[PDB]
Amino acid sequence: KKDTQSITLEELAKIIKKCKHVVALTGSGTSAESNIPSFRGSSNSIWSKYDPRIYGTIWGFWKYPEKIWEVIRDISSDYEIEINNGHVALSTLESLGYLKSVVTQNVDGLHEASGNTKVISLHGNVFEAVCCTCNKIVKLNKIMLQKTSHFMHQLPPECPCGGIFKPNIILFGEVVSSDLLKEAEEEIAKCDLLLVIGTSSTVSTATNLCHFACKKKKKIVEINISKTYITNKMSDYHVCAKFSELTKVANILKGSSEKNKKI
Template sequence: MADDTHREAVQRAASLLAPAQSVLFVTGAGISADSGLPTYRGVGGLYDGEDAEEGLPIEVCLSGEMFRTRPAVTWKYMHEIGRACRGAEPNAAHRAIAALEAERERVWVLTQNVDGLHTAAGSKKLIAIHGDAHELACTRCSWSTRVTDYDAIGFGDDGVPRCPREGCGAIVRPAVILFGEMLPSRALETLYAQLDLGFDAVVSVGTTAVFPYIAAPIQLARAKGKATIEINPGTSEISSLVDVHLRLGAAEAMTQLRAAMTP
């Protein structure tokens, strides 16, 4: 019975998605779970239900305030997250979304993830609203670089990496939005511009949609009578709003959707 329910839901979702020429995919940690990345609390489950060693919530350790006052603490946990995510590759869900971008008139991705896997899969119309952990930038000068492994950048005795540019030596930070920091204005402007254009369909993949800017695209699409789909094994803030809720993992759901839309 469960399999029949899944098949019916996939067929219904495919019938909504197949004619859509403009699609927004809103993705969260769940889409990268099939790549071996943890869906940890806050920045992701590595610390689900537990505080950090310092006795502080992980959200405090990974906050903008902590980075300003005790950058070594923030870098300690960014480095730990980096090790947990080392070697991760895009999975079938990332690749399916990138393929749809190449096939349809206008396909965008709004992602909360900082793992860079959408970029690696080939998505170009991407709004990485929380940044990209692989991008590093000096906090003083214009130096920046891209790395695949934090172990390659070198940490000083004070536990933080520093700018290699001669005469600088300021602390380097990952180009991610830490807790308590403002979202990037350029990314928000792009998001609002695309939402103003509207989408034939909005698909939420692997996110609990607790942030207003993540739930808003589904809410707007529903208000305009456009197709809405959620891919999430569990229940989220938007589950009661969507036309179809696929209770499947991201890779399995996107693989089945692609197959169902293939003539």
């Protein structure tokens, strides 16, 4: 328990200006404004077509290995998916020398697409696949995940060895990479601020990282349209805002940096 206090964007810019090692922890909220709804019970969305108990779990993968591919294929094919202003904002915060890493539960790759340089993919990334017999790695790109691609023609996709391909994403019931976790833990151990943006922090991966940050007594700021499981438990502050409103923080800190003008 902690008495989390609400603050403004300008107050957040103020906090960041003093920091030397800022880390972000991100969830589906940051891709919300990239046309992937975060609320999975939304009936007017892709998630309505698909049973999460199947496509989202490792049991579901072995029973119906086509489904998570169909899901990835449909989101990729049916929606326009570009970096939003949150991403550009996080990208400038690294440029200005504040943001040192983004630890993410998202598998869409948008942080890197915006130019972030140390994105730790705790749940993996939809642009890689592995044969779940021989462990061969195949690199994919957006054009390969389209419904019209040859790679998508037969699902699940098949490996020359005879095994099938599985996306390189961590499903519910699977175990997060212990070398990636250690990377995320050493980032938090060295940070002087953790931004927890667009996540409920109810998945073990997030909850445990936030616990770790309290253990190492790091200052924790939520940026989210809502309070969350860690409000009044783990975060010191909360900015009530959409991820994309982070351009205001980036604009403040960018303006202030332009003190390169002699005088």
